[PDB]
Design a protein around this ligand. Structure first.
Ligand code: HEM
Length: 296
């Protein structure tokens, strides 16, 4: 025995088109607007984006294991990954939604939520594609493919390689750290990254470059970069600044929100599609209208 990389073919939910997804979208979107009290009124947007990434983040380019495709997060093994501590809130918010549209696969719904959360938070438009098919439980990836936080630029670069992401991709995607914040209880990390943490903007790069960062120890006994302004950064975050390579992307993005959003949009979609072979007859990526765009 030899390891051919699996091949995952996207098969659109039987009989669904643009209009159906848009509906899933608006639901998620409306429920975001409605459950505003979550996490100190930060809302469910950031967790939802955290959920889409972590479901895609199990991917291993070599043997085509993990990734969005299978919706394996719905299983225990994955669901209980110490790395996904806190994600249950997102699962919990997506549920009722899955009730209303039972016909959507899990990878599809989970991926779709992140996209929504992104657009709903005024970030860019992320072209999405349907077609992920739930896979059995044995197809769940063992715990541990998710990055550790107490590392450096070397680790982060080596890590992203497994997901086929390059430096510009890594920095673009990291910017999502402007959303939500760290909860000690989840991660051993505590605190926000900046002020506008439920509106997607380039705040993370700016902060990274303009604040006065100091390595301290949290109540969890780990080290984090604290700014006097009350923000924080992970070591992996602070590293985007020690690497010289990384550092000029950060500057470019802190300099142009615009580029930043294009770069992210293209990479986030990639993250969400890693591992899936879409047939050529497959349709194009949809691009959901936001509620606003819809007058809803
Ligand atoms: C080196 C890579 C990464 C590491 C080590 C890292 C780790 C972290 C940690 C530990 C937290 C706090 C979790 C908690 O305590 O609730 C966090 C939060 C989160 N992560 Fe990352 N992150 C990684 C990559 C990224 C990626 C690429 C994305 C999205 C594109 C991102 C999006 C988020 C967001 C939006 C949250 C906020 C979660 C919330 O507010 O509950 N992260 N991540």
């Amino acid at each position: 025995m030899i390891t051919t990389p699996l091949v995952h073919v996207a098969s659109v939910e039987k009989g669904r088109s643009y209009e159906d997804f848009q509906k899933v979208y608006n639901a998620i979107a409306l429920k975001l607007r409605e459950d505003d009290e979550y996490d100190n009124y930060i809302g469910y947007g950031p967790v939802l984006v955290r959920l889409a990434w972590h479901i895609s983040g199990t991917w291993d380019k070599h043997d085509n294991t993990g990734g969005s495709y299978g919706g394996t997060y719905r299983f225990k093994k994955e669901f209980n990954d110490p790395s996904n501590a806190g994600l249950q809130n997102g699962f919990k918010f997506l549920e009722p939604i899955h009730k209303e549209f039972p016909w959507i696969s899990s990878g599809d719904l989970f991926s779709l939520g992140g996209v929504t959360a992104v657009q709903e938070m005024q970030g860019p438009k992320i072209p999405w594609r349907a077609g992920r098919v739930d896979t059995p439980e044995d197809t769940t990836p063992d715990n541990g493919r998710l990055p550790d936080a107490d590392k450096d630029a070397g680790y982060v670069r080596t890590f992203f390689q497994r997901l086929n992401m390059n430096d510009r991709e890594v920095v673009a995607l990291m910017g999502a750290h402007a959303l939500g914040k760290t909860h000690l209880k989840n991660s051993g990390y505590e605190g926000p990254w900046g002020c506008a943490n439920n509106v997607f903007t380039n705040e993370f790069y700016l902060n990274l470059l303009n604040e006065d960062w100091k390595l301290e120890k949290n109540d969890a006994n780990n080290e984090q970069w604290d700014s006097k302004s009350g923000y924080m950064m992970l070591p992996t975050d602070y590293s985007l600044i020690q690497d010289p390579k990384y550092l000029s992307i950060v500057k470019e993005y802190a300099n142009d929100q615009d580029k930043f959003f294009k770069d992210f949009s293209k990479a986030f979609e990639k993250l969400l599609e890693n591992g899936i072979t879409f047939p050529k007859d497959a349709p194009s990526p949809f691009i959901f209208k936001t509620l606003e765009e819809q007058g809803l």
